[PDB]
Amino acid sequence: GQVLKARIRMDAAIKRMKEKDDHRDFAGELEVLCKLGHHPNIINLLGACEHYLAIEYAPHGNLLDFLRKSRVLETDPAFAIANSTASTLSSQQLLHFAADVARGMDYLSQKQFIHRDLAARNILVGENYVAKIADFGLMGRLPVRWMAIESLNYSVYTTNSDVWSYGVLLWEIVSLGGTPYCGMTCAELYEKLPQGYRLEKPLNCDDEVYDLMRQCWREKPYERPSFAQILVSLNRMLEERKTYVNTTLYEKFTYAGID
Numbered sequence: 001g002q003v004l005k006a007r008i009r010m011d012a013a014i015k016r017m018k019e020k021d022d023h024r025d026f027a028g029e030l031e032v033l034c035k036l037g038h039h040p041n042i043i044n045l046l047g048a049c050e051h052y053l054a055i056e057y058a059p060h061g062n063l064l065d066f067l068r069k070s071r072v073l074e075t076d077p078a079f080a081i082a083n084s085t086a087s088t089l090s091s092q093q094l095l096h097f098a099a100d101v102a103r104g105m106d107y108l109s110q111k112q113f114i115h116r117d118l119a120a121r122n123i124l125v126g127e128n129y130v131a132k133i134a135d136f137g138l139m140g141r142l143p144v145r146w147m148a149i150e151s152l153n154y155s156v157y158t159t160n161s162d163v164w165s166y167g168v169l170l171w172e173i174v175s176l177g178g179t180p181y182c183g184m185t186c187a188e189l190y191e192k193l194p195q196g197y198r199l200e201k202p203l204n205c206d207d208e209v210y211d212l213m214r215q216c217w218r219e220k221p222y223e224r225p226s227f228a229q230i231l232v233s234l235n236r237m238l239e240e241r242k243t244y245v246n247t248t249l250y251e252k253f254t255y256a257g258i259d
């Protein structure tokens with residue numbers, strides 16, 4: 001369809017769709033969204049009508065673009081250098097986005113909802129900088145870099161594979177919107193992943209946050225943490241004085257690559 005900002009919350013994004021695939025997908029989507037209920041960390045279905053599917057507007061856009069715009073050394077070096085900072089986002093704000101998504105996915109997974117496409121591109125930064133789970137859709141190419149091995153090999157999609165993808169999302173957050181496995185092809189992933197290859201620890205990252213990521217990517221789906229377990233660990237970290245994601249500038253500072 002076609003998405004435009006509107007007012008009817010009052011501010012809305014509305015999907016405009018003429019009344020065979022699209023008709024099934026629009027009906028299907030509406031069906032899903034009605035069953036989701038309401039929570040601060042999921043998108044807010046305002047309503048649908050026929051003369052159109054509307055959700056509450058998120059003024060800060062999707063999380064991937066938001067993370068990337070925070071890369072202030074690239075965006076505004078004079079501000080960044082003067083302030084010895086690589087990001088307008090603190091470690092606290094970054095882990096809070098991550099906790100929001102964990103909180104939202106715990107809510108959804110307790111209803112046996114399986115997302116299937118968790119990635120920072122599908123998270124909205126909403127009112128008050130509250131992260132909101134969404135799904136904007138997928139040539140319909142498979143999101144290989146976010147997918148659990150069992151999804152790549154057998155099309156097995158569970159809460160456990162959602163946790164895998166969440167771990168990659170966590171990696172995106174910490175790396176400020178870096179491309180996972182940059183400089184590696186998707187075909188190299190089909191090969192290397194079953195060999196036990198995983199994303200490396202970002203330089204700016206505490207071992208403890210890397211360890212949470214690693215738990216999400218266990219080969220055995222059944223050994224991965226639940227979203228509630230992830231949430232509690234993130235909550236623990238956020239309560240501490242300790243800074244977990246280093247955003248300060250140093251002489252050899254480089255960002256995780258994108259393009």
Ligand SMILES: Cc1ccc(C(=O)Nc2cc(CCCN(C)C)cc(C(F)(F)F)c2)cc1Nc1ncccc1-c1ccncn1
Pocket residue numbers: 003013014015029032036042043053054055056057058059061115124133134135136137138
């Ligand atoms: C208008 C609209 C309608 C529906 C959705 C949406 O997220 N739909 C959706 C649809 C599904 C099920 C569909 C899954 N597959 C695509 C089949 C699940 C979710 C869940 F649970 F993850 F949240 C969400 C987003 C949007 N929003 C939107 N879409 C495209 C561009 C921009 C926006 C937008 C911008 C700013 N603020 C809000 N929305």
